[PDB]
Design a protein around this nucleic acid. Structure first.
Ligand SMILES: [K+]
Ligand SMILES: [K+]
Ligand SMILES: [K+]
Ligand SMILES: [K+]
Ligand SMILES: [K+]
Ligand SMILES: [K+]
Ligand SMILES: [K+]
Ligand SMILES: [K+]
Ligand SMILES: [K+]
Ligand SMILES: [Mg+2]
Ligand SMILES: [Mg+2]
Ligand SMILES: [Mg+2]
Ligand SMILES: [Mg+2]
Ligand SMILES: [Mg+2]
Ligand SMILES: [Mg+2]
Ligand SMILES: [Mg+2]
Ligand SMILES: [Mg+2]
Ligand SMILES: [Mg+2]
Ligand SMILES: [Mg+2]
Ligand SMILES: [Mg+2]
Ligand SMILES: [Mg+2]
Ligand SMILES: [Mg+2]
Ligand SMILES: [Mg+2]
Ligand SMILES: [Mg+2]
Ligand SMILES: [Mg+2]
Ligand SMILES: [Mg+2]
Ligand SMILES: [Mg+2]
Ligand SMILES: [Mg+2]
Ligand SMILES: [Mg+2]
Ligand SMILES: [Mg+2]
Ligand SMILES: [Mg+2]
Ligand SMILES: [Mg+2]
Ligand SMILES: [Mg+2]
Ligand SMILES: [Mg+2]
Ligand SMILES: [Mg+2]
Ligand SMILES: [Mg+2]
Ligand SMILES: [Mg+2]
Ligand SMILES: [Mg+2]
Ligand SMILES: [Mg+2]
Ligand SMILES: [Mg+2]
Ligand SMILES: [Mg+2]
Ligand SMILES: [Mg+2]
Ligand SMILES: [Mg+2]
Ligand SMILES: [Mg+2]
Ligand SMILES: [Mg+2]
Ligand SMILES: [Mg+2]
Lengths: 85, 202, 252, 56
RNA sequence: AAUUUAUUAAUGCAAACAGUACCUAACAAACCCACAGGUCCUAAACUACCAAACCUGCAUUAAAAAUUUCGGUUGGGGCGACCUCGGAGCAGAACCCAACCUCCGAGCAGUACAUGCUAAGACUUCACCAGUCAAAGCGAACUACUAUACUCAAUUGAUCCAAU
RNA sequence: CCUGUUUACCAAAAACAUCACCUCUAGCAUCACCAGUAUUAGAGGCACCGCCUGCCCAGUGACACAUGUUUAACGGCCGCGGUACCCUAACCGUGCAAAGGUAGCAUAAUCACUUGUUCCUUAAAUAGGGACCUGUAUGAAUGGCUCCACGAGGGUUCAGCUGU
RNA sequence: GCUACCUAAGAACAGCUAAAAGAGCACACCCGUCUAUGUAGCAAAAUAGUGGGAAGAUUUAUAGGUAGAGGCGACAAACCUACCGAGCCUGGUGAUAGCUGGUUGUCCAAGAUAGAAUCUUAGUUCAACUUUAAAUUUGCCCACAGAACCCUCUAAAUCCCCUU
RNA sequence: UAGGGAAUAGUUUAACAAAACUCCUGACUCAUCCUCAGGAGAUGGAGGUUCAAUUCCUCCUUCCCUAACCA
């Protein structure tokens, strides 16, 4: 949620502007939980999962402030509880 | 992902303090939208054989759509992680523990596969006496089947062909994979003539 | 720059091509880019095809050239016929040409230099009132007023100063033009020019010399270094497929 | 205002000093070559018109 | 009227997503070949088809709107006219002096190419800004040029900013 | 046209609506339209009926796209010179234009001239009615012209009535 | 809870004519044409009489819905709680005002004004005038001499200026 | 402020054999009208170039069309 100058010229009108992410519904498989989840994601999430070599690594490695998802934090607790027990 | 930057400079806040943001700092310019960036490939290690690449343990760079939507979900491929790279590398040592594996390029396999499912139409002229020999046969491979065939790795049905009939020319791709193609020898008709006679009319 | 013409120029540049045989002994043509380049190898190979595909030992080698005969500005250059004999002229003889000269001593010079058809009003009237075919026409300045009658008939093939075919000295084209060979142009103006270069039995070096001569001949229309004038070149025999020669070295 | 009769041009020294001065010339006359004092070399040198600055 | 398209809709491109994939116009004039067809007089190159919508980003055109403004002088305001600069009268003789007072002009042109540099002392449109004149000196020119800050009345436009 | 509607608190009307007529847009269902489906629904103009609604698509708009189509869309629908003596040209010449105001009506609720001219009405009429009318600024669905019924609309009048 | 329009489910409409009715006459009822009275009134829109409609597009009780960048509107720029060219309340807010008004004890002193620019002529900034303090040196009044030709008023005068 | 384009008979235009056209004669008719002819009628201007320039260049005038164009 921000503002822009029309035609990227400061001396022009200042307009409200919202940039929204492109959302995709994809299915992921968790090895630790042995379950498939249909989750709405962004292309950034897919790249981050690729760099982590899987959903489980992504969920476990990513700190709370970067996941920015209550669902993601619940998956982390689920995975961690299975590993702890 | 949309990447933005502020039009207006934000004054330094210092150590251990939060920046003082005026409402002019809400004005942004679009630096770059990363969806329009050139796409990079995804490096995967294959587990099962696939038409595009059919070797278990081959490091393949695929389109992110293909790997994410097909190979990885279905188990055909795995991530090229350090650990997975080691696991498959150990296998390839065991594969070659007896001896080094002979090199057969992926292209060569494809030509072999194409040669398995094709038949050569060796149109020959009625007027002139002809004998189909390796050099002649290699040329026909280029024109009709599109294969650039080494003359030396050529076989034939024992005696080389000399009259119209049915035979087989066995080409060895890279010297390892031998494919025998069905050979149909017909009266020479230029591509122009056949397209007028039949492709145009029929 | 119409989208089709310019986009094709971009596309033709895009087509991949490679030097030398790939590592694979047996490889599908589809699996690798266009290859065969060197003008020496090409001639040697074209002779190979002649034996394999039984055909005349001497054949017309119909060089097709993808000459960037356009994109000087956003306004494109146009096709002309700068005629020059090749270093070793190929065996084609076309000797029907006409010289317009009436009541002048040039009539003698015209025939002395080997004019096929020399005449004045009578010749001009014959062209208008009855059909007659010549490969190229020349006229002295004095006869251009009278010759203007045939302007419409010849559809801009009538002599023009632009082609150096109007002048008191007729031998500019008359003397040399008989042996020289016309570099004709495409009807679709897609830059491909079907122009015989040499007979098949002609030595590779002579055919190579014959090739280079045309390269300069064709650049004559726009021989500027400002805009590249050539993209690709396909040397095809009569009974063979076209081969993509590496013309980039030979361009300048 | 009215149709421009003269133009303003930049006269650049031929001595390579880079010293330039502006002069007025008729639009319909040929490019000017003038002998003008060049401070860098401290003596009169030939100056040749290079560019038109504006229409006067 | 200037400014704008955030908003709504349409369109295009990208993003995203599946796959399957028409190589078309002989003709012998001569010769060959038992046929079927061939030699000569080109048998090239091309290479395309290709995932409908929704959603998101960037553009383009519309729709419907938003923001802000609508100069001054003036024998009330409006209409008409005027708005800066110079010469003359009013203003007779240092300077100065108004009216929608009376008259005539300017928004250049031409010749130079040292209309190069530098520096005492002064003038000044009633402020400021701007504008004006200049000895000496340096460098030139020069011992024929009313030669040294060109003729000409006004012949004109600040700051920011842009181009270089 | 009619019944009806409107400025609660200065305007009830000739303004609005209205039956009728016409143009435009849409081939469709689970919240309006509609539990409907082109004899339908929605957006508008004009205003029952009667007799009519003339010419123009150049410009703007809309639509359609190869030109183009469309005015019951926004709008428009001339001047000159001469020719029967003057009052006027059926008629020709001529420039211009997309077309050049057709029918009807007309001193009108219609710029001014204007209290137009004439007939009727009064003893006397800038009022009223009927005509004449080039209205040079009338005029045909932003409708023209008649005509029943209707009106707390505006104007004129006979007779009666009355302290106006 | 007024009012505009809508939704749900209710109620009222004598008598006479015609018997068909957005028909006529005429109560209840609704509306408000004209006059008078009233005008701090009985009333922040009334009273008396006279009127329009009164089986319909009628009037009316009850509950509910649409909310201000809006609603609703048989368009009067209507109506949306007595004041709607767009409600009311609180807040931003001590909005802003070159505009008007106001600005509180005593006493003394100096003190009246060429102009320029300005979306400026109801205002400002710079000059000018004016005030206080400080510095050190002339200020005012003025003798001869001196300050233009062109041109019709050969003007009253001025400028400069020692002495005093 | 730029750009581009255009200047052919009195009118325009063909970039083409060149015309129409107005005016002005004639002919045809028993005569008049129609009609049919002929007659002269131009390569914006200017300059250069070329033996020769509507046809190669240049500046100006008039007109048309397009558009940027900052303080
Ligand atoms: K007055
Ligand atoms: K009411
Ligand atoms: K009424
Ligand atoms: K139109
Ligand atoms: K009358
Ligand atoms: K009424
Ligand atoms: K009361
Ligand atoms: K006052
Ligand atoms: K003021
Ligand atoms: Mg004023
Ligand atoms: Mg006045
Ligand atoms: Mg005015
Ligand atoms: Mg001063
Ligand atoms: Mg000096
Ligand atoms: Mg009726
Ligand atoms: Mg009222
Ligand atoms: Mg009333
Ligand atoms: Mg009405
Ligand atoms: Mg009607
Ligand atoms: Mg009409
Ligand atoms: Mg007469
Ligand atoms: Mg009429
Ligand atoms: Mg009138
Ligand atoms: Mg009366
Ligand atoms: Mg009218
Ligand atoms: Mg009217
Ligand atoms: Mg209309
Ligand atoms: Mg009445
Ligand atoms: Mg009524
Ligand atoms: Mg109901
Ligand atoms: Mg009743
Ligand atoms: Mg009734
Ligand atoms: Mg009644
Ligand atoms: Mg009334
Ligand atoms: Mg009541
Ligand atoms: Mg109502
Ligand atoms: Mg109204
Ligand atoms: Mg009004
Ligand atoms: Mg209120
Ligand atoms: Mg407030
Ligand atoms: Mg205040
Ligand atoms: Mg005092
Ligand atoms: Mg100003
Ligand atoms: Mg003032
Ligand atoms: Mg004094
Ligand atoms: Mg003194």
């Amino acid at each position: 949620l921000g503002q822009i100058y029309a035609n990227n010229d400061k001396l022009s009108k200042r307009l409200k502007k919202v940039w929204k992410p492109q959302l995709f519904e994809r299915e992921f498989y968790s090895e630790i939980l042995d379950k498939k989840f249909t989750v709405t994601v962004t292309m950034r999430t897919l790249d981050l999962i690729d760099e982590a070599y899987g959903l489980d690594f992504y969920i476990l490695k990513t700190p709370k402030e970067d996941l920015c998802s209550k669902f993601g934090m619940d998956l982390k607790r689920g995975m961690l509880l299975r590993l702890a027990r | 992902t949309v990447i933005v930057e502020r039009w207006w400079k934000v004054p330094l806040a210092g150590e251990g303090r939060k920046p003082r943001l005026h409402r002019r700092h809400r004005v942004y310019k679009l630096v770059e939208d990363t969806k329009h960036r050139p796409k990079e490939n995804l490096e995967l290690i294959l587990t099962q054989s696939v038409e595009n690449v059919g070797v278990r343990g081959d490091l393949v760079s695929v389109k992110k759509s293909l790997g994410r939507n097909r190979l990885l979900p279905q188990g055909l491929a795995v991530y090229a992680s350090p650990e997975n790279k080691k696991l498959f590398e150990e296998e390839k040592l065991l594969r070659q523990e007896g001896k080094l594996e002979k090199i057969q390029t992926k292209a060569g396999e494809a030509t072999v596969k194409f040669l398995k499912s094709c038949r050569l139409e060796v149109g020959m002229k009625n007027n002139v006496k002809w004998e189909l020999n390796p050099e002649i046969v290699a040329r026909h491979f280029f024109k009709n089947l599109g294969v650039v065939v080494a003359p030396h790795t050529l076989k034939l049905p024992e005696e080389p062909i000399t009259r119209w009939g049915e035979y087989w020319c066995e080409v060895t791709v890279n010297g390892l994979d031998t494919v025998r193609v069905p050979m149909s020898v017909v009266n020479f008709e230029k591509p122009k003539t056949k397209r007028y006679k039949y492709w145009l009319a029929q | 720059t119409p989208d089709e013409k310019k986009d094709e120029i971009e596309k033709i540049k895009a087509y991949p091509y490679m030097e030398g045989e790939p590592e694979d002994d047996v490889y599908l043509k589809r699996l690798y880019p266009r290859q065969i380049y060197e003008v020496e190898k090409a001639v040697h190979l074209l002779k190979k095809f002649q034996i394999l595909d039984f055909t005349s030992p001497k054949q017309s080698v119909y060089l097709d050239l993808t000459l960037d005969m356009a994109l000087g500005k956003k306004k494109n250059v146009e096709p002309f016929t700068s005629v020059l004999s090749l270093p070793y002229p190929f065996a084609s003889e076309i000797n029907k040409v006409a010289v317009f000269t009436e009541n002048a001593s040039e009539v003698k010079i015209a025939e002395e230099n080997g004019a096929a058809f020399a005449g004045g009003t009578s010749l001009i009237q014959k062209i208008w009132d009855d059909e007659i075919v010549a490969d190229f026409y020349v006229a002295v300045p004095e006869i251009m007023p009278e010759l203007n009658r045939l302007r419409k008939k010849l559809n801009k093939k009538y002599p023009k100063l632009s082609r150096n075919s109007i002048g008191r000295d007729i031998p500019k084209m008359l003397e040399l033009f008989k042996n020289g060979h016309e570099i004709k142009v495409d009807e679709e103006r897609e830059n491909f020019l079907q122009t015989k270069i040499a007979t098949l039995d002609m030595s590779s070096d002579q055919i190579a010399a014959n090739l280079q001569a045309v390269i300069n001949e064709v650049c004559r229309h726009r021989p500027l270094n400002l805009g590249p004038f050539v993209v690709r070149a396909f040397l095809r025999s009569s009974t063979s497929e076209g081969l993509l020669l590496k013309i980039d070295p030979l361009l300048p | 205002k009215s149709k421009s009769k003269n133009i303003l041009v930049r006269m650049v020294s031929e001595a390579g000093t880079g010293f330039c001065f502006n002069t007025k010339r008729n639009r319909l006359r040929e490019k000017l070559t003038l002998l003008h004092y060049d401070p860098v070399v401290k003596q009169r040198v030939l100056f040749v018109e290079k560019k038109k600055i504006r229409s006067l």
